[PDB]
Ligand binder design. Structure first.
Ligand SMILES: [Zn+2]
Ligand SMILES: [Zn+2]
Ligand SMILES: [Zn+2]
Ligand SMILES: [Zn+2]
Lengths: 217, 214
């Protein structure tokens, strides 16, 4: 099986150095070029550059020119992407890709699974969790506001995973502060508010966990 | 330096539809166009190369056409696993450049949001910040206008929103909007309102509460 596998996710501060990797297996590494592609959160794909692993010849986009160095180490069939000084603007998913020439063009026929790189001045912080209850019907909404954490992600469950139906946990937004925030809500029968509702908020990075009972009041 | 522009940016389609996505090159590029599909959280996947050559393993319901400046991707009978984002890429010259992508979403019938508003908790207010939350539940299509009014005055630049992906059961969206204020600003005003405009509503729906008296 042709297969490119990338190193793990990174959380870094601006000014730091980073080298991420991509190891090919199931083919002749020196025989196929390797492209790197940036995908910013919510955005499309950006070709950064390429390299012929056999002699380490490199091509860069006029955009990524100089700001990033691509390299190859055929000793153990591994390609590299590296920065000397990261900026918060470098925050993105990064994919390595195998260039397979066919029909007279270079095609990205095989892709690594992606490396998430988050760059921020912020420091690790568990979230505060606030109830979302209606002021003083058909369906009724209640929720939890999970505020001021870093980095992503948190996971929310309701009533220890006992409640999954009708829950929406929204994608996190990045605040001015550099900290994330997100809401989780659930709609329930208005004749239940009887039933107790508690959101469980787990934040692995801060090794932290918060249960919040959401009172009908 | 060849600009790749895809159309449309997004489209809704039903299972069994024929779907066409177009790609225009800022200059000629011959036949050197490739199509990629990407699902959320996953790496892209090659579908077509050389404008019309079907990549090994890819279902024949996928086909490409065009030459020079104009190219099309056709999906002849959309299957459930085809809802995704599609990228074209020119391979004429370096740098390699990708189109901005076309997202294929699921068509369904118009559905009006259920709307809810949530005051700040007392717990948050102690930290000295006030978050007001407005929720739009299960609506279709995605386009929705949410406006915050405080003391009946339109707010700007002090709120953020996010939207879910289409629900796996009913294919609707849900939306959350957050107005953030300092506790002292929060306490000066009385009336907090979320005004929602959307296709399935005859006219805007307003949800509100009065600070202190709730
Ligand atoms: Zn060479
Ligand atoms: Zn530059
Ligand atoms: Zn819902
Ligand atoms: Zn006022």
């Amino acid at each position: 099986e042709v297969q490119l596998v990338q190193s793990g996710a990174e959380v870094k501060k601006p000014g730091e150095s980073l080298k991420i990797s991509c190891k090919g297996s199931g083919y002749s590494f020196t025989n196929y070029w390797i492209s790197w592609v940036r995908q910013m959160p919510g955005k499309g794909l950006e070709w950064m550059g390429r390299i012929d692993p056999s002699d380490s010849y490199t091509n860069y986009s006029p955009s990524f020119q100089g700001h990033v160095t691509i390299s190859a180490d055929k000793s153990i069939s591994t390609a590299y992407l590296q920065w000397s000084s990261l900026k918060a603007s470098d925050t993105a998913m990064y994919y390595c890709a195998r260039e397979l020439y066919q029909g007279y063009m270079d095609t990205f026929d095989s892709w690594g699974q992606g490396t998430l790189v988050t760059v921020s001045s912020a420091s690790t912080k568990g979230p505060s969790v606030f109830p979302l209850a209606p002021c003083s019907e058909s369906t009724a909404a209640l929720g939890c506001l999970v505020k001021d954490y870093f980095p992503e992600p948190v996971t929310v469950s309701w009533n220890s995973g006992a409640l999954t139906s009708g829950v929406h946990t929204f994608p996190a937004v990045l605040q001015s502060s550099g900290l994330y925030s997100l809401s989780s809500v659930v709609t329930v029968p208005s004749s239940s508010l009887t039933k107790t509702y508690t959101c469980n908020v787990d934040h692995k990075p801060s090794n932290t966990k918060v249960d919040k009972r959401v009172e009908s009041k | 330096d060849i600009q790749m522009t895809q159309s449309p940016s997004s489209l809704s389609a039903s299972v069994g539809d024929r779907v066409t996505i177009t790609c225009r090159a800022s200059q000629s590029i011959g036949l050197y166009l490739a199509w990629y599909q990407q699902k959320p959280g996953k790496a892209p996947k090659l579908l077509i190369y050389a404008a019309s050559s079907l990549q090994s393993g890819v279902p024949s319901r996928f086909s490409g056409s065009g030459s020079g400046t104009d190219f099309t991707l056709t999906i002849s009978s959309l299957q459930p696993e085809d809802f995704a984002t599609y990228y074209c890429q020119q391979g004429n010259t370096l740098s390699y450049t990708f189109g901005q992508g076309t997202k294929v979403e699921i068509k369904r019938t118009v559905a009006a949001p259920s709307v809810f508003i949530f005051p700040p908790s007392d717990e948050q207010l102690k930290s000295g910040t006030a978050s007001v939350v407005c929720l739009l539940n299960n609506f279709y299509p995605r386009e929705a206008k949410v406006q915050w009014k405080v003391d009946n005055a339109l707010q700007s630049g002090n709120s953020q929103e996010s939207v879910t992906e289409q629900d796996s059961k009913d294919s609707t969206y849900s939306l959350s909007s957050t107005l953030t204020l300092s506790k002292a600003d929060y306490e000066k005003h009385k009336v907090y309102a979320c005004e929602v405009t959307h296709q399935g509503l005859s006219s805007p729906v307003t949800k509100s509460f009065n600070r202190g008296e709730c």
